[PDB]
RNA sequence: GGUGAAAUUCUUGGAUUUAUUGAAGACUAACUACUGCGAAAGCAUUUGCCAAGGACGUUUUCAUUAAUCAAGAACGAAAGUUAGGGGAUCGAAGAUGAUCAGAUACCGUCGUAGUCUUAACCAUAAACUAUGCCGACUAGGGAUCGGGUGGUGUUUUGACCCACUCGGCACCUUACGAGAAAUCAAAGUCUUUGGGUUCUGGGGGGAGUAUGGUCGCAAGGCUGAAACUUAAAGGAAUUG
């Protein structure tokens, strides 16, 4: 509930006492029931396996990458999202990766990850026709819907409120030194307007 | 007989919601209520449960996949790539 | 016996560069162009301006300790002309007549395989 | 010229003026029928029987030695195919192009080629329904043609 | 122009060559001539070093100068400074390429052009890309005015060239490959095998360039300089 | 082409399609060859192999699924394993 | 009326010919229609040959050559005197000068 | 006037007759 | 830097130029031709996989199954549209510097949509050979692409060389012939008018416009008049 991507319950075997230990994963596409999942430093390069980032070639596509070795998953956990692997730095024990947002990072080679692309992709390309379908979406997320506009309020409630017309009256762009109660609008905006051109990332 | 000429499944939504948004929804609903192949047993009995969960009644097997189809174009590319890298690096 | 450097001559229309470097190419020794010997823009590509410039790099090179140089003649290249400008031959002539020995000569314009698009449009410069 | 192209080649065989068996042929006519029947017993089509019999044995052509055409010998013995042999090969080639298109949906030339082949299939099956070798109402349906060949 | 400078600065002298010195370049031992030239650098101040600037600058030479004959004057060699020893530098093989003039003269029209490139790793863990070129030649007593080749011919020629190149590059070290390029041996290999397919002229190894290098081991380098 | 050899066996010789008919054939020693679909599950494929080890019969792995093996034998339904009992006029047993 | 039997180009048995760009005015003209010449010249011009030989640090150094192939559109071919208007009978001639 | 630009003018004219008439319809 | 010459612009806070290194997108030079393939639009780096095709060879098989087509359908440059991705170059719009009587143009520098890919629309062009398709016949000469036959030709049947043949892309000479001519081996075998067949035109404008349909999200595509006006518009050559 509340999570776009499906989960997968993989059950490993306790290596120090006689019992089973079930773990909750986030499924990657193609992972079906009954599949064997191998996790370690010497696992194969197949979809569903957990390998360190330094044990895969360039161009590998991974998911649920931990940003320090042992966090248990940080970086690609939404639906349809993945992480690309650009290069290796043997002399510093680091690996360069591309994140969903388009940013580059350097993280330890011992950081783990799962191979593939998170399941349940294409979710946000089907419209929500009705206010009812947004009502039930956030009913299992949290209390953030409906949203009232600041400019439809009185000045006692929001910085934007008030006036014989609905208008702001001051620039919507707000400084990063602003205090609580002032940050409403575009906080620390580097630009504004319709985005024309190349991203220039 | 052909009951609707172009509204098809989306006819339930009435005159509501504009034509562009009803064409868009029609494309994906037809994908999520179809039946696919269970490659493990050849039968065409793969339906959708929740989003991303594809179930077949014959085997009681479930396969993770897209929100509206079994396989997306992005996953397939990764599948072929991994076959190439694995079959290229094991040398 | 002979101390060798390299002389790069960029003979373009609208200007000409004459500058010498070490054999490795990381340290420059003397640079002087045609635009620091004339007072009108249309003359920056003339043989005379290139000739005066080459005599200055000949001056500085001798006083740094060089007695011979290879030659690398270039034009703009790429999507541009790919033909030597007017001042290339004057510069090479001037270096020789300044008592600075000459080794190998080579043309190093960047030829683009097949390239990005060329400016001017589909109908070209209508003039 | 060609039915579905601009080719105008004139290549073809030229059978001898003489309708009599060559003087150097000695093995009997009934012996040759034994070759035909045992070859069809292992699947070879009428065209293949003749080739294998021309460049391994001396049979210039069955019509001159045995007295009947290869096909007419086969049907008398009961080896006649279910559908004529030239139709069988046009269908077999339509199955291959269709199977190729299911995988490559951007192959706009294989689509066009498939239109030409299926057009040849219909023009020919009509000839066969008139002379009553195929039963009337025989129809080449794409979804089911795979069964016919195999 | 002289007097067209608008503003010198965005706001409102020491002679450089009084603080430099000359080092002496040394080639690897695979070549006969060990001296190639000299080069400059600023002297080692307290906060900077000469070594950190002398490393990695590449010097382009001619194999004719390193072998003593100007018949070998259409190839070029590149060398990379790997270690600074006193006042003289020590360099190592880096690549090889034809001169622009030589390559263009080979490409005349009325003849097909065959190329082949192979990526192989030598026995001492270098990675190389070797390029090859060839042409087809008008035969004696030929009346036809052009000497083209069918694509069936070109594909076979490109298969033979690739395999001789892989064979001759792997199984040998980078120094051995260098000593093997000088006599132009590989050309004779290619033609002796391609002769039965189509007569060719101007078989050459156009260029060789390094893609990766193994972990530096000083002792290995000294073997080519002692 | 394997398919052309299958067709001649179906027309001339005799065969048994389906899993349960195959195990009965192997047990009685009748089987001459068995042909397994590519996507027969791993457990069942193993069970067929062990039987064939005891009866000393050959195993050929077809390059296709149930649907493809069925159309190869010319049946509109899907066949997962076929066992040859008499070769008829085909050279399947002594070839491949 | 029809002026040339080749339509001013060299396309027969071909639908399309990809284009190139003129070297003077930067305009696209199909490859088979463009006027094409080869300009090969010693790198060191004739008047400078003596000085360079006297300056060479070698004996018997062969002068390198520069090669390039030039494409002109019709407008820039007429102007640069590469081709010139030609009479009726004299248009059919193919043999170079 | 050039045949090409006459075609363009007529097209821009029709586009406007197509929207003035849409007021009544 | 830029031009015929210049100005805007960038530059002592180091531009232009030199070296080493890396990222991204596009493109596929020279070889490249009176050469190749495809129904046309079109197609040029290496290799693997999938299916397809012409010509040639054939003492293989069927035996008239054929030719051309109203309606109907597949593909269909560029620009254009809808949604993701990519976005290096060039660049409708836009902004600027200069010329000019004006310059909201040509020239110089920026620059969004576009350019490229996936999914889906459009259905257009000087989409030209301004030349419909199938068949037979009629003049001379050489060069070239594929296949086949003869020459144990010659170099060391692969490459060439000579003769012949079939199928192509074309080319040179000529007029028995055609044409108003320009020209044409088809545009010939048509007043000595008949091999089979499909499509279109009837002086120039109004007009590919109005209106009615039908297709398209839109731009628009296909079908397509009338009143009125007018003695000329037009094709190829000749002398100025």
Cα separation, G51 vs C93, whole angstroms: 7
**Sign of the C-alpha dihedral computed for residues F69, F75, F77 and F81 taken in this order:** negative
In which domain, by residue range, is G12 found?
1-97
DSSP character at residue F40: S
Show the domains of chain D with their CATH numbers. Answer: 26-80 (no CATH), 81-150 (1.10.287.10)
Residue where the block lists tokens 């002399």: A91
For nucleotide I14, the protein residue with its alpha carbon nearest to C1' is E9
Cα separation, A76 vs A60, whole angstroms: 14
CATH architecture of C1-127: 2-Layer Sandwich (3.30)
DSSP character at residue A96: E
Cα separation, C119 vs C121, whole angstroms: 6
Q: Please, are residues C81 and C18 in contact by the beta-carbon 8 Å criterion?
A: no
Q: Count other Cβ atoms within 10 Å, centred on residue B20.
A: 9
Q: Count other Cβ atoms within 10 Å, centred on residue E12.
A: 4
Q: Buried (b) or exposed (e) across B68-89, using 16+ Cβ within 10 A?
A: bbbebebbeebbeebeebbeee
H/E stretch holding E190 reads: helix E185-194
Residues after which chain H has a gap (C–N > 2.5 Å): none
CA–CA–CA angle D8, D14, D16 (5° rounding): 165
Cα separation, G28 vs A127, whole angstroms: 46
Beta-bridge partner residues of B85 = none
* Burial label, E199 (beta-carbon count in 10 A; 0-12, 13-18, 19+): middle
Beta-bridge partner residues of H6 = none
Contact D/F (≥3 CB pairs under 8 Å):
yes
Give first-to-last CA distance, chain E, whole Å. Answer: 54
Cα separation, A75 vs A105, whole angstroms: 11
C-alpha separations of C49 from A76, C69, C88, D120 in Å: 63, 21, 11, 78
Residue where the block lists tokens 């001013």: G8
By DSSP bridging, strand G41-42 and strand G65-66 are antiparallel
Q: Please, are residues A52 and A32 in contact by the beta-carbon 8 Å criterion?
A: no
Beta carbons of A32 and B25 less than 8 Å apart: no
C-alpha separations of E82 from A91, D32, E12, E56, E208 in Å: 19, 85, 46, 7, 19
- Among C30, C38, C24, CA closest to C9: C30
C-alpha separations of G39 from C109, G66, G69 in Å: 15, 8, 6
Cα radius of gyration rounded to whole Å, chain F:
12
Per DSSP, the residues of C42-75 read: GGTTSHHHHHHHHHHHHHHHHHHT--EEEEEEE-
CATH, residue G32: 3.30.1740.20
Residue where the block lists tokens 């190839």: E75
Using CA coordinates, name the residue in chain A closest to B10. A129
- What are the backbone dihedrals phi and psi of residue E212, each rounded to the nearest 5 degrees, phi first? -155, 160
Cα separation, B9 vs G97, whole angstroms: 76
* B66 has a chain A CB within 8 A of its CB: yes
Write out E126-156 in H/E/C secondary structure.
CEEEEEEEEEECCCCCCCCCCECCCHHHHHH
Cα separation, E213 vs E179, whole angstroms: 19
- Among G46, G59, G49, CA closest to E73: G59
In chain F, which residues touch D (CB < 8 A)?
3-4, 7-8, 12, 71-72, 74, 76, 89-91
Cα separation, E209 vs E58, whole angstroms: 13
Q: Is D94 strand, coil or helix?
A: helix
- Among B4, B16, B38, B24, CA closest to B68: B24
Structure resolution in Å? Answer: 3.0
Q: Tokens at residue F64, please?
A: 């296709």
* Burial label, E132 (beta-carbon count in 10 A; 0-12, 13-18, 19+): buried
By DSSP bridging, strand A186-187 and strand A173-174 are parallel
Q: Buried (b) or exposed (e) across F5-23, using 16+ Cβ within 10 A?
A: bbbbbbeebebbbeeebbb
Q: What is the CATH number of domain F1-96?
A: 3.30.1330.30
- Among F22, F37, F33, F31, CA closest to F69: F37
Q: From the Cβ of E212, is strand I under 7 Å away? A: no
Q: Chains with 3 or more CB pairs closer than 8 angstroms to A? A: B
Q: How far is B40 from chain A (nearest CA, A)?
A: 11
**Sign of the C-alpha dihedral computed for residues C112, C115, C116 and C117 taken in this order:** positive
H/E stretch holding G53 reads: helix G49-55
- Among A118, A109, A25, CA closest to A68: A109
Q: Please, are residues F25 and F31 in contact by the beta-carbon 8 Å criterion?
A: yes
Q: Count other Cβ atoms within 10 Å, centred on residue E25.
A: 21
Domain borders along chain C are 1-127
Q: Which technique?
A: cryo-EM
> A146: cis peptide before it, omega within 30°?
yes
Please tell me the total count of domains within chain G: 1
Q: Tokens at residue C9, please?
A: 């001559």
Beta carbons of E1 and C44 less than 8 Å apart: yes
* Burial label, C108 (beta-carbon count in 10 A; 0-12, 13-18, 19+): middle
Smallest CA–C1' separation from D16: which nucleotide?
I59
Q: Please, are residues B42 and F66 in contact by the beta-carbon 8 Å criterion?
A: yes
Helix spans in B1-91 (H): 19-32, 73-89
Contacts of residue H23, Cβ cutoff 8 Å, sequence gap at least 6:
none
Q: Please, are residues B25 and A129 in contact by the beta-carbon 8 Å criterion?
A: yes
């Amino acid at each position: 509930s509340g999570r776009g991507a499906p989960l997968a319950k993989v059950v490993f075997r306790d290596p120090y006492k006689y019992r089973l230990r079930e773990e909750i994963f986030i499924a990657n596409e193609g992972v079906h029931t009954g599949q064997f999942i191998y996790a370690g430093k010497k696992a194969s390069l197949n979809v569903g396996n957990v390998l360190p980032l330094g044990s895969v070639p360039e161009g590998t596509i991974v998911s649920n990458v931990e940003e320090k070795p042992g966090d248990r998953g940080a970086l690609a956990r939404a639906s349809g999202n993945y992480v690309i692997i650009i290069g290796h730095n043997p002399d510093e024990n680091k690996t360069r990766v591309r994140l969903p947002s388009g940013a580059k990072k350097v993280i330890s080679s011992d950081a783990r990850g799962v191979i593939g692309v998170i399941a349940g992709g294409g979710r946000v390309d089907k419209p929500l026709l009705k206010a009812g379908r947004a009502f039930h979406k956030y009913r299992l997320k949290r209390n953030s819907w409906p949203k009232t506009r600041g400019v439809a309020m009185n000045p006692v409630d929001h910085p934007h409120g008030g006036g014989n017309h609905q208008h702001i009256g001051k620039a919507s762009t707000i400084s990063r030194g602003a205090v609580s109660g002032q940050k409403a609008g575009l906080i620390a905006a580097r630009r504004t307007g319709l985005l024309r051109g190349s991203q220039k990332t | 007989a052909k009951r609707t000429k172009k509204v098809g499944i989306t006819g339930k939504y009435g005159v509501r919601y504009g034509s562009s948004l009803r064409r868009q929804v029609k494309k994906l609903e037809i994908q999520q209520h179809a039946r696919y192949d269970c490659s493990f047993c050849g039968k065409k009995t793969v339906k959708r449960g929740a989003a991303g969960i594809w179930t077949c009644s014959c085997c009681k097997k479930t396969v993770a996949g897209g929100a509206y189809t079994v396989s997306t174009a992005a996953a397939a590319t990764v599948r072929s790539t991994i076959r190439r890298l694995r079959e290229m690096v094991e040398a | 016996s002979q101390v060798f450097g390299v002389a790069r001559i960029y003979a373009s229309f609208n200007d000409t560069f004459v500058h010498v470097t070490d054999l490795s190419g990381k340290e420059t020794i003397a640079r002087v162009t045609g635009g620091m010997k004339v007072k009108a823009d249309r003359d920056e590509s003339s043989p005379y301006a290139a000739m005066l410039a080459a005599q200055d790099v000949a001056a500085k090179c001798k006083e740094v300790g060089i007695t011979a140089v290879h030659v690398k003649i270039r034009a703009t290249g790429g999507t541009r002309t790919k033909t030597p400008g007017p001042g290339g031959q004057a510069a090479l002539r001037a270096l020789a007549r300044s008592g600075l020995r000459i080794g190998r000569i080579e043309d190093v314009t960047p030829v683009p395989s097949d390239s990005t698009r060329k400016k001017g449009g589909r109908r070209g410069r209508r003039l | 010229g060609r039915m579905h192209s601009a080719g105008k080649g004139i290549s073809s065989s030229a059978i001898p003026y003489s309708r009599n068996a060559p003087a150097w042929f000695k093995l009997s006519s009934e012996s040759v029928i034994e070759q035909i029947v045992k070859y069809a017993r292992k699947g070879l089509t009428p065209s293949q029987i003749g080739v294998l019999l021309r460049d391994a044995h001396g049979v210039t052509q069955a019509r001159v030695i045995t007295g009947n055409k290869i096909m007419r010998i086969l049907k008398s013995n009961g080896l006649a195919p279910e559908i004529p042999e030239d139709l069988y090969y046009l269908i077999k080639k339509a199955v291959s192009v269709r199977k190729h298109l299911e995988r490559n949906r951007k192959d706009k030339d294989a689509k066009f080629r498939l239109i030409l082949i299926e057009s040849r299939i219909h023009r020919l099956a009509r000839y066969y329904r008139t002379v009553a070798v195929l039963p009337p109402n025989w129809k080449y349906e794409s979804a089911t043609a795979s069964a016919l060949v195999n | 122009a002289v007097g067209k400078n608008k503003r010198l600065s965005k706001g409102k002298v020491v002679d450089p060559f009084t603080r430099k010195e000359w080092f002496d370049i040394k080639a690897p031992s695979t070549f006969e001539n060990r001296n190639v030239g000299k080069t400059l650098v600023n002297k080692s101040t307290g906060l900077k070093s000469a070594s950190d600037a002398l490393k990695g600058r590449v010097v382009e030479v001619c194999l004719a100068d390193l072998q003593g004959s100007e018949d070998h004057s259409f190839r070029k060699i590149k060398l990379r400074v790997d270690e600074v020893q006193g006042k003289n530098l020590l360099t190592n093989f880096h690549g090889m390429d034809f001169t622009t003039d030589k390559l263009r003269s080979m490409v005349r029209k009325w003849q097909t052009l065959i190329e082949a490139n192979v990526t192989v790793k030598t026995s001492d863990d270098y990675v190389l890309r070797i390029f090859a070129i060839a042409f087809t030649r008008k035969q004696a007593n030929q009346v036809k005015r052009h000497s083209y080749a069918q694509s069936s011919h070109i594909r076979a020629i490109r298969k033979v060239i690739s395999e001789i190149l892989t064979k001759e590059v792997q199984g040998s070290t980078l120094a051995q490959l260098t000593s093997k390029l000088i006599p132009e041996v590989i050309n004779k290999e290619i033609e002796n095998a391609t002769k039965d397919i189509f007569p060719l002229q101007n078989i050459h190894v156009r260029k060789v360039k390094l893609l990766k290098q193994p972990k530096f081991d000083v002792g290995a380098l000294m073997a080519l300089h002692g | 082409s394997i398919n052309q050899k299958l067709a001649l066996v179906i027309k001339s010789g005799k065969y048994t399609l389906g899993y349960k008919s195959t195990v009965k054939s192997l047990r009685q020693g009748k089987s001459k060859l068995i042909i397994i679909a590519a996507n027969t599950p791993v457990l069942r494929k193993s069970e067929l192999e062990y039987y064939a080890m005891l009866s000393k019969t050959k195993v050929y792995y077809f390059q296709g699924g149930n649907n493809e093996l069925g159309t190869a034998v010319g049946k509109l339904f899907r066949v997962g394993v076929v066992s040859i009992l008499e070769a008829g006029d085909s050279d399947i047993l002594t070839t491949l | 009326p029809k002026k040339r039997a080749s339509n001013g180009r060299n396309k027969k048995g071909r639908g399309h010919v990809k284009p190139v760009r003129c070297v003077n005015c930067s305009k696209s003209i199909p490859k088979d229609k463009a006027i094409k010449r080869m300009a090969i010249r010693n790198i060191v011009e004739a008047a400078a040959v003596r000085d360079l030989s006297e300056a060479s640090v070698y004996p018997e150094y062969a002068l390198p050559k520069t090669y390039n192939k030039l494409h002109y559109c019709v407008s820039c071919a007429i102007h640069a005197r590469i081709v010139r208007v030609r009479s009726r009978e004299d248009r059919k001639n193919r043999a170079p000068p | 006037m050039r045949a090409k630009w006459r075609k363009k003018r007529t097209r821009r004219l029709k586009r406007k007759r197509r929207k003035v008439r849409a007021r009544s319809k």
